[PDB]
Design a protein around this ligand. Structure first.
Ligand SMILES: CN[C@@H](C)Cc1ccccc1
Length: 229
C-alpha cells in the first residue's frame, strides 16, 4: 500500500556529493518516518537516518555533518544527500517507510546501487554462525546476541534473498509479519534472541538479519546465511 523507489547516479567520484531521491507512491499517510538504510558489499546493513511526517530528522552519529535528509512533499519525494563520499560509501541504498502506530509493517524500496571509485554509541548485534546449511525438514535455530540490552518489542528480524530487498519477517521478538509461514517463530529477551523454523523448506534458504531500534542509532546484525544441504 506504500510503494517506494530510489534513483540517482550509480557512480560517484571521491569527495563528491551523493544525491538520491526516494519517490513515494501509493496511499496517503498521516504519520511515520522515511528512513535511508544502506547495505554494504557483504551485506551489512547501516541505518543512516530518517525524516518524519513532521519533517523532524535523526542522523546516524557516524554520518553527521555529511548527511542530510529532506522532503519535497508536493512531489511526494524524500531525498538523501551525503557529502565528501569515499569508497566506504559504496552500497545499495534503500528508502523505507514505517509508522510506529503499527509495529507489524515496514515497506522497503527496490534499492539503488552506488559505487565510489560525530561521537556516539551503538548496540552491536551478533549473529553466529555467519553461514549455515541444513537439510529439508530439520528444525533450525538462528541466534542474535546484543552487546547491550534491548527492549523485546523493538527486536526485529528480516529475510533477504539475492537480488531483492530485506523483508520484515518477525516483529517485536515473536510476531510473524504478513507473508511469513507459521513454521517460523522467535523468542528471547534482554540481550539474547532466536528465530526458529520448525521444519526447514527449500524456500527458507536466504539471509536473516536481526535488528534493534530500541537505542539510537538503530543497528542490524551481520546476518546468518541459511543454505539448504
Ligand atoms: C523497525 N525498523 C525501524 C528502522 C523503523 C523506524 C524508523 C524510524 C523511527 C522509528 C522506527
Amino acid at each position: 500500500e506504500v510503494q517506494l523507489q530510489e534513483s540517482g547516479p550509480s557512480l560517484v567520484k571521491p569527495s563528491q556529493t551523493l544525491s538520491l531521491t526516494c519517490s513515494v507512491t501509493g496511499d496517503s499517510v498521516t504519520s511515520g518516518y522515511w528512513s535511508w538504510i544502506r547495505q554494504f558489499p557483504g551485506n551489512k546493513l547501516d541505518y543512516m537516518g530518517y525524516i518524519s511526517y513532521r519533517g523532524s530528522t535523526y542522523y546516524n552519529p557516524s554520518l553527521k555533518s555529511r548527511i542530510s535528509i529532506t522532503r519535497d512533499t508536493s512531489k511526494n519525494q524524500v531525498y538523501l544527500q551525503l557529502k565528501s563520499v569515499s569508497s566506504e560509501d559504496t552500497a545499495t541504498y534503500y528508502c523505507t517507510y514505517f509508522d510506529s502506530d503499527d509495529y507489524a509493517m515496514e515497506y522497503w524500496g527496490q534499492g539503488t546501487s552506488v559505487t565510489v571509485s560525530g561521537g556516539g554509541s551503538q548496540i552491536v548485534l551478533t549473529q553466529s554462525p555467519a553461514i549455515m546449511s541444513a537439510s529439508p525438514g530439520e528444525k533450525v535455530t538462528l541466534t542474535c546476541s546484543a552487546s547491550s540490552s534491548v527492549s523485546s518489542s523493538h527486536l526485529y528480524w528480516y529475510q533477504q534473498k539475492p537480488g531483492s530487498s530485506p523483508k520484515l519477517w518477525i516483529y517485536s521478538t515473536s510476531n510473524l509479519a504478513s507473508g511469513v509461514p507459521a513454521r517460523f517463530s522467535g523468542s528471547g529477551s534482554g540481550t539474547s534472541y532466536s528465530l526458529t523454523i520448525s521444519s526447514m523448506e527449500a524456500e527458507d534458504a536466504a539471509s536473516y538479519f536481526c535488528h534493534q531500534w530500541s537505542s539510537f542509532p538503530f543497528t542490524f546484525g551481520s546476518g546468518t546465511k541459511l543454505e539448504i544441504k
